[PDB]
Amino acid sequence: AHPPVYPKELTQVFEHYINNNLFDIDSLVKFIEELGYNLEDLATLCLAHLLGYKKLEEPLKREDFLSTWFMQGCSTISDMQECIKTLDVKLHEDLQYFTQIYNYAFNLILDPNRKDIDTDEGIQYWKLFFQPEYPVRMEPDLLEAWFRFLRDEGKTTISKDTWRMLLLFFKRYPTIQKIISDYDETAAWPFIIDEFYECLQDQQ
Ligand SMILES: [Cl-]
Ligand SMILES: [Cl-]
Ligand SMILES: [Cl-]
Ligand SMILES: [Cl-]
Ligand SMILES: [Pt+2]
């Protein structure tokens, strides 16, 4: 009798969280909580990315759960906890990884049958991503003005273009004054960012 491909300990974790025939969203939520996290955490994005999720609420195939953890040398909950802790450090320190996870976040949380995410959910993640502990340095007043602009101008969904480009925009112009002084409306930035620029101009 040949030994199993995957350690007994590892298949035991999968079997613990599976709901009937699927490792579904409820499985993921309970698993994340046992790892020490909440669904909304940026660390959860790192976990989902590691496991190869395309959509947050899509079931995770047994083989994908096992092969992923096996390749990372993890068989137990404690091993998996150490892995995510390592990814979380990388999210804080590694600009390439940070940019990758920032971009990944949009498609992961996107509907089934939508092109855009809700503004509420965008702001929820933006408030996490643009904290000082992460690689992109910017003034809090600017981030706040962005949220206020979206609310005030009735911007209720956010597109992939707005999402991806905002990261570049805040990196390039990390302060309201720098946007005021230096932004060029002819430079082919998203229209929504042109609108934000004009909003900032009007508040001066
Ligand atoms: Cl884009
Ligand atoms: Cl572009
Ligand atoms: Cl680009
Ligand atoms: Cl970019
Ligand atoms: Pt871009």
Side-chain angles (χ1 to χ4, degrees), residues 63-98:
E63 194 71 39
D64 289 338
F65 175 98
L66 304 169
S67 61
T68 297
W69 286 125
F70 185 78
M71 286 306 303
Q72 290 298 127
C74 297
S75 59
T76 66
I77 289 289
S78 80
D79 291 343
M80 302 165 186
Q81 291 171 345
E82 301 175 7
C83 180
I84 303 306
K85 195 170 196 183
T86 295
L87 295 181
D88 198 3
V89 170
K90 191 160 69 160
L91 187 66
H92 286 82
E93 307 190 334
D94 178 333
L95 195 34
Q96 187 206 39
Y97 186 60
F98 177 83

mmCIF file of all heavy atoms in Angstrom, residues 63-98:
data_model
loop_
_atom_site.group_PDB
_atom_site.id
_atom_site.type_symbol
_atom_site.label_atom_id
_atom_site.label_comp_id
_atom_site.label_asym_id
_atom_site.label_seq_id
_atom_site.Cartn_x
_atom_site.Cartn_y
_atom_site.Cartn_z
ATOM 1 N N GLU A 63 -7.568 19.465 -5.030
ATOM 2 C CA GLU A 63 -6.216 19.315 -5.561
ATOM 3 C C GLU A 63 -5.457 20.647 -5.486
ATOM 4 O O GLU A 63 -4.253 20.661 -5.214
ATOM 5 C CB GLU A 63 -6.230 18.774 -7.006
ATOM 6 C CG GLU A 63 -4.865 18.274 -7.509
ATOM 7 C CD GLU A 63 -4.428 16.992 -6.841
ATOM 8 O OE1 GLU A 63 -5.282 16.110 -6.606
ATOM 9 O OE2 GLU A 63 -3.234 16.867 -6.548
ATOM 10 N N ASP A 64 -6.155 21.762 -5.712
ATOM 11 C CA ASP A 64 -5.516 23.080 -5.648
ATOM 12 C C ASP A 64 -5.099 23.437 -4.207
ATOM 13 O O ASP A 64 -4.009 23.962 -3.998
ATOM 14 C CB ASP A 64 -6.440 24.148 -6.252
ATOM 15 C CG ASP A 64 -6.554 24.024 -7.774
ATOM 16 O OD1 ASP A 64 -5.655 23.434 -8.406
ATOM 17 O OD2 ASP A 64 -7.553 24.496 -8.338
ATOM 18 N N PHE A 65 -5.951 23.132 -3.225
ATOM 19 C CA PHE A 65 -5.621 23.347 -1.806
ATOM 20 C C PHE A 65 -4.393 22.511 -1.417
ATOM 21 O O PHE A 65 -3.408 23.018 -0.888
ATOM 22 C CB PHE A 65 -6.838 23.007 -0.920
ATOM 23 C CG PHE A 65 -6.572 23.092 0.572
ATOM 24 C CD1 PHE A 65 -6.938 24.237 1.301
ATOM 25 C CD2 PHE A 65 -5.979 22.026 1.247
ATOM 26 C CE1 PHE A 65 -6.710 24.298 2.696
ATOM 27 C CE2 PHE A 65 -5.737 22.081 2.627
ATOM 28 C CZ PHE A 65 -6.107 23.220 3.355
ATOM 29 N N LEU A 66 -4.435 21.223 -1.734
ATOM 30 C CA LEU A 66 -3.354 20.328 -1.330
ATOM 31 C C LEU A 66 -2.036 20.615 -2.043
ATOM 32 O O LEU A 66 -1.002 20.695 -1.387
ATOM 33 C CB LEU A 66 -3.764 18.850 -1.492
ATOM 34 C CG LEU A 66 -5.043 18.385 -0.764
ATOM 35 C CD1 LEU A 66 -5.398 16.971 -1.290
ATOM 36 C CD2 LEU A 66 -4.882 18.370 0.751
ATOM 37 N N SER A 67 -2.061 20.738 -3.373
ATOM 38 C CA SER A 67 -0.807 20.960 -4.112
ATOM 39 C C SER A 67 -0.119 22.267 -3.681
ATOM 40 O O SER A 67 1.099 22.294 -3.518
ATOM 41 C CB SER A 67 -1.008 20.924 -5.629
ATOM 42 O OG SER A 67 -1.904 21.939 -6.051
ATOM 43 N N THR A 68 -0.908 23.318 -3.481
ATOM 44 C CA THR A 68 -0.394 24.622 -3.054
ATOM 45 C C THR A 68 0.347 24.522 -1.723
ATOM 46 O O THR A 68 1.508 24.951 -1.602
ATOM 47 C CB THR A 68 -1.523 25.673 -2.931
ATOM 48 O OG1 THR A 68 -2.133 25.894 -4.211
ATOM 49 C CG2 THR A 68 -0.951 27.010 -2.443
ATOM 50 N N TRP A 69 -0.326 23.954 -0.721
ATOM 51 C CA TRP A 69 0.255 23.828 0.607
ATOM 52 C C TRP A 69 1.448 22.885 0.609
ATOM 53 O O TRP A 69 2.455 23.162 1.256
ATOM 54 C CB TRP A 69 -0.794 23.411 1.635
ATOM 55 C CG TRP A 69 -1.767 24.528 2.008
ATOM 56 C CD1 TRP A 69 -3.128 24.490 1.952
ATOM 57 C CD2 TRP A 69 -1.422 25.826 2.503
ATOM 58 N NE1 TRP A 69 -3.667 25.692 2.406
ATOM 59 C CE2 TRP A 69 -2.631 26.526 2.739
ATOM 60 C CE3 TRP A 69 -0.201 26.470 2.764
ATOM 61 C CZ2 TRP A 69 -2.655 27.848 3.229
ATOM 62 C CZ3 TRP A 69 -0.224 27.770 3.259
ATOM 63 C CH2 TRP A 69 -1.447 28.449 3.479
ATOM 64 N N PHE A 70 1.350 21.785 -0.138
ATOM 65 C CA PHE A 70 2.478 20.858 -0.257
ATOM 66 C C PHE A 70 3.711 21.520 -0.866
ATOM 67 O O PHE A 70 4.801 21.311 -0.371
ATOM 68 C CB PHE A 70 2.121 19.595 -1.065
ATOM 69 C CG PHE A 70 3.234 18.586 -1.102
ATOM 70 C CD1 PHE A 70 3.475 17.762 -0.010
ATOM 71 C CD2 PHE A 70 4.077 18.493 -2.213
ATOM 72 C CE1 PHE A 70 4.535 16.829 -0.038
ATOM 73 C CE2 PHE A 70 5.128 17.578 -2.240
ATOM 74 C CZ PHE A 70 5.358 16.753 -1.152
ATOM 75 N N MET A 71 3.531 22.307 -1.923
ATOM 76 C CA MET A 71 4.643 23.011 -2.574
ATOM 77 C C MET A 71 5.318 24.001 -1.625
ATOM 78 O O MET A 71 6.529 24.186 -1.692
ATOM 79 C CB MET A 71 4.188 23.745 -3.833
ATOM 80 C CG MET A 71 3.890 22.865 -5.036
ATOM 81 S SD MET A 71 5.251 21.757 -5.484
ATOM 82 C CE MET A 71 6.594 22.916 -5.732
ATOM 83 N N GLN A 72 4.535 24.599 -0.727
ATOM 84 C CA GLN A 72 5.052 25.496 0.315
ATOM 85 C C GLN A 72 5.610 24.794 1.556
ATOM 86 O O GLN A 72 5.994 25.450 2.535
ATOM 87 C CB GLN A 72 3.949 26.453 0.752
ATOM 88 C CG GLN A 72 3.584 27.459 -0.291
ATOM 89 C CD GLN A 72 4.768 28.351 -0.644
ATOM 90 O OE1 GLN A 72 5.136 28.490 -1.811
ATOM 91 N NE2 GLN A 72 5.412 28.895 0.375
ATOM 92 N N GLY A 73 5.631 23.465 1.532
ATOM 93 C CA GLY A 73 6.113 22.682 2.656
ATOM 94 C C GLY A 73 5.239 22.767 3.898
ATOM 95 O O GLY A 73 5.725 22.605 5.015
ATOM 96 N N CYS A 74 3.943 23.017 3.706
ATOM 97 C CA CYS A 74 3.002 23.151 4.825
ATOM 98 C C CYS A 74 2.046 21.968 4.888
ATOM 99 O O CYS A 74 1.438 21.587 3.861
ATOM 100 C CB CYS A 74 2.174 24.430 4.674
ATOM 101 S SG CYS A 74 3.160 25.951 4.720
ATOM 102 N N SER A 75 1.899 21.398 6.082
ATOM 103 C CA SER A 75 0.921 20.322 6.277
ATOM 104 C C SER A 75 -0.047 20.591 7.425
ATOM 105 O O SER A 75 -1.111 19.986 7.493
ATOM 106 C CB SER A 75 1.608 18.960 6.425
ATOM 107 O OG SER A 75 2.494 18.980 7.517
ATOM 108 N N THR A 76 0.307 21.512 8.323
ATOM 109 C CA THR A 76 -0.513 21.750 9.494
ATOM 110 C C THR A 76 -0.994 23.199 9.527
ATOM 111 O O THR A 76 -0.427 24.064 8.858
ATOM 112 C CB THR A 76 0.258 21.476 10.811
ATOM 113 O OG1 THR A 76 1.313 22.433 10.944
ATOM 114 C CG2 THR A 76 0.847 20.034 10.852
ATOM 115 N N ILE A 77 -1.999 23.464 10.355
ATOM 116 C CA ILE A 77 -2.476 24.834 10.578
ATOM 117 C C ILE A 77 -1.347 25.791 11.006
ATOM 118 O O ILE A 77 -1.244 26.908 10.479
ATOM 119 C CB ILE A 77 -3.653 24.870 11.588
ATOM 120 C CG1 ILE A 77 -4.925 24.283 10.945
ATOM 121 C CG2 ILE A 77 -3.864 26.300 12.153
ATOM 122 C CD1 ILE A 77 -5.556 25.153 9.863
ATOM 123 N N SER A 78 -0.503 25.340 11.934
ATOM 124 C CA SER A 78 0.653 26.134 12.355
ATOM 125 C C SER A 78 1.606 26.465 11.197
ATOM 126 O O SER A 78 2.087 27.605 11.109
ATOM 127 C CB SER A 78 1.393 25.474 13.524
ATOM 128 O OG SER A 78 2.244 24.432 13.074
ATOM 129 N N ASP A 79 1.860 25.492 10.306
ATOM 130 C CA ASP A 79 2.716 25.722 9.129
ATOM 131 C C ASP A 79 2.114 26.814 8.251
ATOM 132 O O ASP A 79 2.837 27.726 7.796
ATOM 133 C CB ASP A 79 2.857 24.461 8.247
ATOM 134 C CG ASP A 79 3.673 23.338 8.897
ATOM 135 O OD1 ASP A 79 4.416 23.569 9.874
ATOM 136 O OD2 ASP A 79 3.572 22.200 8.394
ATOM 137 N N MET A 80 0.804 26.685 8.001
ATOM 138 C CA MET A 80 0.038 27.631 7.176
ATOM 139 C C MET A 80 0.040 29.020 7.807
ATOM 140 O O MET A 80 0.219 30.005 7.116
ATOM 141 C CB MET A 80 -1.407 27.144 6.967
ATOM 142 C CG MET A 80 -1.478 25.753 6.310
ATOM 143 S SD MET A 80 -3.106 24.996 6.440
ATOM 144 C CE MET A 80 -2.762 23.367 5.753
ATOM 145 N N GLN A 81 -0.146 29.090 9.122
ATOM 146 C CA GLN A 81 -0.009 30.366 9.828
ATOM 147 C C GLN A 81 1.365 31.024 9.596
ATOM 148 O O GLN A 81 1.444 32.215 9.306
ATOM 149 C CB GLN A 81 -0.280 30.174 11.331
ATOM 150 C CG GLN A 81 -1.730 29.852 11.663
ATOM 151 C CD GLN A 81 -1.936 29.448 13.130
ATOM 152 O OE1 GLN A 81 -0.977 29.132 13.836
ATOM 153 N NE2 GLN A 81 -3.193 29.442 13.581
ATOM 154 N N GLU A 82 2.441 30.258 9.693
ATOM 155 C CA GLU A 82 3.776 30.812 9.452
ATOM 156 C C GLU A 82 3.926 31.299 8.011
ATOM 157 O O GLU A 82 4.546 32.350 7.756
ATOM 158 C CB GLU A 82 4.866 29.788 9.764
ATOM 159 C CG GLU A 82 4.833 29.284 11.202
ATOM 160 C CD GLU A 82 5.842 28.191 11.465
ATOM 161 O OE1 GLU A 82 6.675 27.893 10.581
ATOM 162 O OE2 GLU A 82 5.803 27.608 12.569
ATOM 163 N N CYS A 83 3.350 30.547 7.072
ATOM 164 C CA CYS A 83 3.379 30.940 5.664
ATOM 165 C C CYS A 83 2.707 32.298 5.441
ATOM 166 O O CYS A 83 3.294 33.202 4.815
ATOM 167 C CB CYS A 83 2.733 29.863 4.779
ATOM 168 S SG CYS A 83 2.729 30.304 3.018
ATOM 169 N N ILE A 84 1.496 32.458 5.969
ATOM 170 C CA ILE A 84 0.770 33.722 5.784
ATOM 171 C C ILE A 84 1.463 34.899 6.482
ATOM 172 O O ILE A 84 1.460 36.033 5.984
ATOM 173 C CB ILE A 84 -0.727 33.596 6.190
ATOM 174 C CG1 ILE A 84 -1.402 32.457 5.389
ATOM 175 C CG2 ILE A 84 -1.495 34.931 5.945
ATOM 176 C CD1 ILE A 84 -1.234 32.585 3.840
ATOM 177 N N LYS A 85 2.059 34.628 7.634
ATOM 178 C CA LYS A 85 2.830 35.643 8.336
ATOM 179 C C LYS A 85 3.967 36.140 7.425
ATOM 180 O O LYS A 85 4.201 37.350 7.320
ATOM 181 C CB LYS A 85 3.357 35.062 9.647
ATOM 182 C CG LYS A 85 3.856 36.099 10.626
ATOM 183 C CD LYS A 85 4.118 35.454 11.992
ATOM 184 C CE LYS A 85 4.235 36.512 13.060
ATOM 185 N NZ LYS A 85 4.572 35.876 14.379
ATOM 186 N N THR A 86 4.637 35.207 6.746
ATOM 187 C CA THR A 86 5.690 35.520 5.784
ATOM 188 C C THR A 86 5.196 36.329 4.588
ATOM 189 O O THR A 86 5.853 37.291 4.165
ATOM 190 C CB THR A 86 6.416 34.243 5.325
ATOM 191 O OG1 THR A 86 7.089 33.687 6.456
ATOM 192 C CG2 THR A 86 7.446 34.549 4.247
ATOM 193 N N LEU A 87 4.034 35.959 4.055
ATOM 194 C CA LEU A 87 3.450 36.718 2.961
ATOM 195 C C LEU A 87 3.081 38.139 3.404
ATOM 196 O O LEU A 87 3.218 39.102 2.641
ATOM 197 C CB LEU A 87 2.226 35.999 2.398
ATOM 198 C CG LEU A 87 2.519 34.649 1.729
ATOM 199 C CD1 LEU A 87 1.210 34.064 1.185
ATOM 200 C CD2 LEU A 87 3.594 34.749 0.613
ATOM 201 N N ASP A 88 2.580 38.256 4.630
ATOM 202 C CA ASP A 88 2.196 39.553 5.173
ATOM 203 C C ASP A 88 3.422 40.476 5.299
ATOM 204 O O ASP A 88 3.352 41.678 4.979
ATOM 205 C CB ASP A 88 1.488 39.355 6.525
ATOM 206 C CG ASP A 88 0.681 40.571 6.957
ATOM 207 O OD1 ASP A 88 0.621 41.560 6.196
ATOM 208 O OD2 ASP A 88 0.082 40.521 8.064
ATOM 209 N N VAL A 89 4.546 39.928 5.748
ATOM 210 C CA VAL A 89 5.805 40.685 5.771
ATOM 211 C C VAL A 89 6.175 41.146 4.345
ATOM 212 O O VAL A 89 6.552 42.294 4.138
ATOM 213 C CB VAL A 89 6.954 39.867 6.428
ATOM 214 C CG1 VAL A 89 8.290 40.558 6.225
ATOM 215 C CG2 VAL A 89 6.685 39.686 7.922
ATOM 216 N N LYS A 90 6.026 40.259 3.358
ATOM 217 C CA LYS A 90 6.344 40.574 1.965
ATOM 218 C C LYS A 90 5.449 41.699 1.407
ATOM 219 O O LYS A 90 5.914 42.600 0.678
ATOM 220 C CB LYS A 90 6.255 39.280 1.117
ATOM 221 C CG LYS A 90 6.818 39.426 -0.296
ATOM 222 C CD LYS A 90 7.177 38.083 -0.964
ATOM 223 C CE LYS A 90 5.957 37.249 -1.285
ATOM 224 N NZ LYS A 90 6.287 36.190 -2.348
ATOM 225 N N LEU A 91 4.171 41.673 1.785
ATOM 226 C CA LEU A 91 3.216 42.709 1.381
ATOM 227 C C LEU A 91 3.638 44.087 1.892
ATOM 228 O O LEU A 91 3.424 45.113 1.234
ATOM 229 C CB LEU A 91 1.829 42.380 1.921
ATOM 230 C CG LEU A 91 0.679 43.273 1.442
ATOM 231 C CD1 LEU A 91 0.451 43.078 -0.092
ATOM 232 C CD2 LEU A 91 -0.598 43.008 2.223
ATOM 233 N N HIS A 92 4.247 44.098 3.067
ATOM 234 C CA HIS A 92 4.748 45.344 3.680
ATOM 235 C C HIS A 92 6.063 45.832 3.080
ATOM 236 O O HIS A 92 6.304 47.032 3.045
ATOM 237 C CB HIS A 92 4.920 45.160 5.196
ATOM 238 C CG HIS A 92 3.622 45.139 5.939
ATOM 239 N ND1 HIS A 92 2.842 44.010 6.047
ATOM 240 C CD2 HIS A 92 2.955 46.120 6.594
ATOM 241 C CE1 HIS A 92 1.748 44.294 6.730
ATOM 242 N NE2 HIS A 92 1.802 45.568 7.087
ATOM 243 N N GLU A 93 6.910 44.909 2.629
ATOM 244 C CA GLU A 93 8.299 45.211 2.263
ATOM 245 C C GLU A 93 8.607 45.196 0.751
ATOM 246 O O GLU A 93 9.518 45.903 0.299
ATOM 247 C CB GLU A 93 9.250 44.236 2.978
ATOM 248 C CG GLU A 93 9.080 44.155 4.507
ATOM 249 C CD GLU A 93 10.190 43.366 5.229
ATOM 250 O OE1 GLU A 93 10.830 42.467 4.628
ATOM 251 O OE2 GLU A 93 10.401 43.617 6.436
ATOM 252 N N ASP A 94 7.870 44.395 -0.018
ATOM 253 C CA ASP A 94 8.234 44.053 -1.404
ATOM 254 C C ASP A 94 7.286 44.817 -2.332
ATOM 255 O O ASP A 94 6.083 44.554 -2.348
ATOM 256 C CB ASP A 94 8.139 42.509 -1.578
ATOM 257 C CG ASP A 94 8.449 42.005 -3.009
ATOM 258 O OD1 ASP A 94 8.264 42.719 -3.999
ATOM 259 O OD2 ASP A 94 8.857 40.833 -3.138
ATOM 260 N N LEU A 95 7.829 45.784 -3.081
ATOM 261 C CA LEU A 95 6.988 46.691 -3.864
ATOM 262 C C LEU A 95 6.349 45.968 -5.030
ATOM 263 O O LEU A 95 5.198 46.242 -5.388
ATOM 264 C CB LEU A 95 7.815 47.888 -4.364
ATOM 265 C CG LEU A 95 7.130 49.152 -4.905
ATOM 266 C CD1 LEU A 95 5.792 49.513 -4.218
ATOM 267 C CD2 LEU A 95 8.114 50.316 -4.809
ATOM 268 N N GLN A 96 7.076 45.024 -5.613
ATOM 269 C CA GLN A 96 6.511 44.226 -6.693
ATOM 270 C C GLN A 96 5.328 43.395 -6.219
ATOM 271 O O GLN A 96 4.281 43.348 -6.884
ATOM 272 C CB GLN A 96 7.552 43.320 -7.320
ATOM 273 C CG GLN A 96 7.022 42.626 -8.540
ATOM 274 C CD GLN A 96 7.716 41.336 -8.823
ATOM 275 O OE1 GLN A 96 8.041 40.571 -7.901
ATOM 276 N NE2 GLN A 96 7.907 41.041 -10.105
ATOM 277 N N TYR A 97 5.511 42.726 -5.074
ATOM 278 C CA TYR A 97 4.446 41.894 -4.493
ATOM 279 C C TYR A 97 3.256 42.747 -4.083
ATOM 280 O O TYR A 97 2.099 42.398 -4.349
ATOM 281 C CB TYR A 97 4.976 41.138 -3.280
ATOM 282 C CG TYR A 97 3.989 40.148 -2.707
ATOM 283 C CD1 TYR A 97 3.503 39.081 -3.478
ATOM 284 C CD2 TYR A 97 3.542 40.271 -1.394
ATOM 285 C CE1 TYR A 97 2.587 38.135 -2.927
ATOM 286 C CE2 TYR A 97 2.623 39.347 -0.847
ATOM 287 C CZ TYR A 97 2.158 38.297 -1.624
ATOM 288 O OH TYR A 97 1.277 37.401 -1.075
ATOM 289 N N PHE A 98 3.542 43.875 -3.425
ATOM 290 C CA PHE A 98 2.495 44.810 -3.036
ATOM 291 C C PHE A 98 1.660 45.256 -4.249
ATOM 292 O O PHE A 98 0.425 45.271 -4.183
ATOM 293 C CB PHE A 98 3.102 46.021 -2.311
ATOM 294 C CG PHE A 98 2.096 47.062 -1.938
ATOM 295 C CD1 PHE A 98 1.348 46.928 -0.781
ATOM 296 C CD2 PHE A 98 1.875 48.164 -2.765
ATOM 297 C CE1 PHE A 98 0.382 47.881 -0.426
ATOM 298 C CE2 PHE A 98 0.910 49.122 -2.420
ATOM 299 C CZ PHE A 98 0.176 48.983 -1.239
#
